[PDB]
């Protein structure tokens, strides 16, 4: 089946991501970023307080249903 992940915005908006455990989280970052209308290099994704790479998967990070991912912004100096 699909694993329902959750994204918690810094404003309060909740985004539910319906993806599979074999499905790379890379598309997750891009999909959300596309909706924001910005470069993926401007934001940062964190899971369990650790930054996520473009080579990680839900089944690789031992993620479960309702797992929330944090989305921050990079410092512009």
């Amino acid at each position: 089946d699909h694993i329902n992940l959750k994204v918690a915005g810094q404003d309060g908006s909740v985004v539910q991501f319906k993806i599979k455990r074999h499905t790379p989280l890379s598309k997750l970052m891009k999909a959300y970023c596309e909706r924001q209308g910005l470069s993926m290099r401007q934001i940062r994704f964190r899971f369990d307080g650790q930054p996520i790479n473009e080579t990680d998967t839900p089944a690789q990070l031992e993620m479960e249903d309702e797992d929330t991912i944090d989305v921050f912004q990079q410092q512009t100096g």
Binding site: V7, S13, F17, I19, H22, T23, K27
Partner: peptide, 12 residues
């Protein structure tokens, strides 16, 4: 409030 639903499919 605001709720967003995104579904991504991967093909291999």
């Amino acid at each position: 409030d605001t709720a967003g639903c995104i579904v991504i499919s991967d093909s291999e």
